[PDB]
Amino acid sequence: MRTVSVEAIVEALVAEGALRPEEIADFVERITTL
Amino acid sequence: NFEDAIVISEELLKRDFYTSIHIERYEIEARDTKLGPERITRDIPHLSEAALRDLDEEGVVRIGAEVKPGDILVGRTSFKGESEPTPEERLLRSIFGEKARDVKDTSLRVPPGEGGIVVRTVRLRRGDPGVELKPGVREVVRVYVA
Amino acid sequence: KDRINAIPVDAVFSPVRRVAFQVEDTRLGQRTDLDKLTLRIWTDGSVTPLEA
Amino acid sequence: GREPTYIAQEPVSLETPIGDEKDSFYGDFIPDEHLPSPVDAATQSLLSEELEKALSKLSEREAMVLKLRKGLIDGEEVGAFFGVTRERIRQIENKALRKLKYHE
Amino acid sequence: GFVEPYIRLFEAIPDAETELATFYDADLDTLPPRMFLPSGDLYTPPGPVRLEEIKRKRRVRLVKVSIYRFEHVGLGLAARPYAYAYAWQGDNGILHLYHAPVVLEDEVTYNESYVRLMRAMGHVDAF
Amino acid sequence: FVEPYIRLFEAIPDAETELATFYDADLDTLPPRMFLPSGDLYTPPGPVRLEEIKRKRRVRLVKVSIYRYAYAYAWQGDNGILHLYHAPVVL
Numbered sequence: 001m002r003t004v005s006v007e008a009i010v011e012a013l014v015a016e017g018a019l020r021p022e023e024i025a026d027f028v029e030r031i032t033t034l
Numbered sequence: 035n036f037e038d039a040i041v042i043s044e045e046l047l048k049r050d051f052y053t054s055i056h057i058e059r060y061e062i063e064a065r066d067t068k069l070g071p072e073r074i075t076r077d078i079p080h081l082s083e084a085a086l087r088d089l090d091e092e093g094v095v096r097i098g099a100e101v102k103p104g105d106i107l108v109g110r111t112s113f114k115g116e117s118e119p120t121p122e123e124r125l126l127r128s129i130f131g132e133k134a135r136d137v138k139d140t141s142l143r144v145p146p147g148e149g150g151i152v153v154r155t156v157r158l159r160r161g162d163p164g165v166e167l168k169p170g171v172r173e174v175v176r177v178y179v180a
Numbered sequence: 181k182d183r184i185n186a187i188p189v190d191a192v193f194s195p196v197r198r199v200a201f202q203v204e205d206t207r208l209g210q211r212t213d214l215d216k217l218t219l220r221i222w223t224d225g226s227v228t229p230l231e232a
Numbered sequence: 233g234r235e236p237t238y239i240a241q242e243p244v245s246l247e248t249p250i251g252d253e254k255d256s257f258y259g260d261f262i263p264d265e266h267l268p269s270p271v272d273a274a275t276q277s278l279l280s281e282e283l284e285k286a287l288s289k290l291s292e293r294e295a296m297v298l299k300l301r302k303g304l305i306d307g308e309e310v311g312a313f314f315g316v317t318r319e320r321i322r323q324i325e326n327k328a329l330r331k332l333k334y335h336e
Numbered sequence: 337g338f339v340e341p342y343i344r345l346f347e348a349i350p351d352a353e354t355e356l357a358t359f360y361d362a363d364l365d366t367l368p369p370r371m372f373l374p375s376g377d378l379y380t381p382p383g384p385v386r387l388e389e390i391k392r393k394r395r396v397r398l399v400k401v402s403i404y405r406f407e408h409v410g411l412g413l414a415a416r417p418y419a420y421a422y423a424w425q426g427d428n429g430i431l432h433l434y435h436a437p438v439v440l441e442d443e444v445t446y447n448e449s450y451v452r453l454m455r456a457m458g459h460v461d462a463f
Numbered sequence: 464f465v466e467p468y469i470r471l472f473e474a475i476p477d478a479e480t481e482l483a484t485f486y487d488a489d490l491d492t493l494p495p496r497m498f499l500p501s502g503d504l505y506t507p508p509g510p511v512r513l514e515e516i517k518r519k520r521r522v523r524l525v526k527v528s529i530y531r532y533a534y535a536y537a538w539q540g541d542n543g544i545l546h547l548y549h550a551p552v553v554l
């Protein structure tokens with residue numbers, strides 16, 4: 001199959017200038033679980 | 035000083051007038067995983083001794099050390115992905131000195147851009163003494179650079 | 181850095197604070213349009229103005 | 233009111249507008265870890281064949297009790313026993329591995 | 337007297353307020369853990385290793401590593417002393433050599449399938 | 464008998480400072496402090512000459528030739544002090 005790691009993808013999202021580390025943080029936090 | 039450019043006397047930098055302190059904040063979690071728990075530790079596997087000179091015995095960069103983009107701030111080691119393979123490996127765990135699995139490097143490093151000198155650290159460890167750590171979050175560690 | 185905890189400081193070596201020269205008209209003898217170049221030097225004491 | 237102490241989760245789709253409910257899709261921010269995925273096939277190929285080697289060189293009543301308990305369906309040792317005491321299975325189990333680990 | 341500089345190097349590791357860690361006392365009985373040279377390169381031992389603790393902190397320790405060679409005696413193999421190297425061990429058990437190993441100038445056996453498996457998972461040089 | 468003293472020298476802390484000036488002792492000049500691995504003072508029956516092998520910012524590895532005869536390997540700091548890695552091998 002195929003692997004991946006979210007910590008590096010999140011830092012890339014934070015660098016990309018989409019939203020602030022607040023919104024991306026809420027995103028990763030909903031990503032974690034419910 | 036074309037359109038709206040400005041020209042500056044080097045006397046300002048000597049007198050250090052236009053200097054302003056700035057502090058960034060770097061953060062990692064020692065999350066807990068299918069593979070096994072991740073660990074905030076100093077013995078990272080494939081690291082030269084020179085790359086560890088500034089990390090304390092726990093893996094955290096020491097206070098007062100200049101960190102350049104690519105250095106280690108907090109050392110984290112996580113087990114090799116793709117799972118715990120029960121049929122065969124579970125026997126090996128009893129055969130071969132148990133906990134002699136494999137662990138990789140997933141530390142925290144000064145990003146492209148830069149950092150400065152480490153000025154403060156924050157450990158929020160298990161046995162959580164008043165902290166709301168997220169589900170599967172084991173500890174969190176912060177380093178402030180200036 | 182001498183020791184591992186030292187903190188390097190910016191270095192302003194030049195012991196010269198300000199420097200001004202004055203070009204004053206001096207008649208002397210035959211000619212009017214001669215220059216009395218008198219230049220003027222301030223320093224912190226590490227080296228004297230003459231020394232500089 | 234508490235959420236206490238002491239292989240199951242639900243997939244999140246690949247395309248979901250992140251951020252300020254914008255145009256990004258979530259696959260867009262995933263870079264990769266590696267392409268070839270080595271130590272898989274060349275390892276299990278050694279891994280499996282060097283198992284059956286020692287696995288058959290001691291008694292089959294010894295080696296297979298755990299080959300298939302820890303390896304075939306589940307686990308246990310309250311019923312590991314095909315019909316002996318819960319104490320002799322732990323006895324022969326451990327003693328089996330030990331002569332299996334190193335032979336004097 | 338040739339252990340003194342490596343004590344100096346280990347006591348130069350910065351400390352941190354932590355609780356103490358229980359270290360992986362590898363021996364001939366157990367897997368030799370991953371070993372690394374100061375250059376970060378992986379060192380592979382010819383067999384198992386024995387560890388002699390010189391100093392320790394909360395979370396790392398200085399050890400004299402006695403690394404052993406396997407040799408054919410009887411059915412399979414027994415352990416002769418081969419080389420020694422000073423290192424520091426962490427709470428993952430991994431050994432961090434302060435130098436390349438010092439090669440030593442010059443009634444218990446193990447299975448062959450035992451050393452078969454150590455070659456497979458990679459803590460043993462072949463040949 | 465020189466290689467083990469190249470790894471014992473490499474094991475010295477790499478303190479990043481200015482390159483220090485080591486005192487290249489000679490027949491013309493004095494013999495400096497010389498210390499055995501135990502910390503004991505060794506006094507030579509004559510002056511010493513040095514030959515540099517390796518070189519950090521703050522320390523260097525030298526071969527200490529002693530005349531009146533013998534030699535020994537040691538490291539030397541910005542204070543010129545020769546810390547011997549072994550008692551001088553008498554030729």
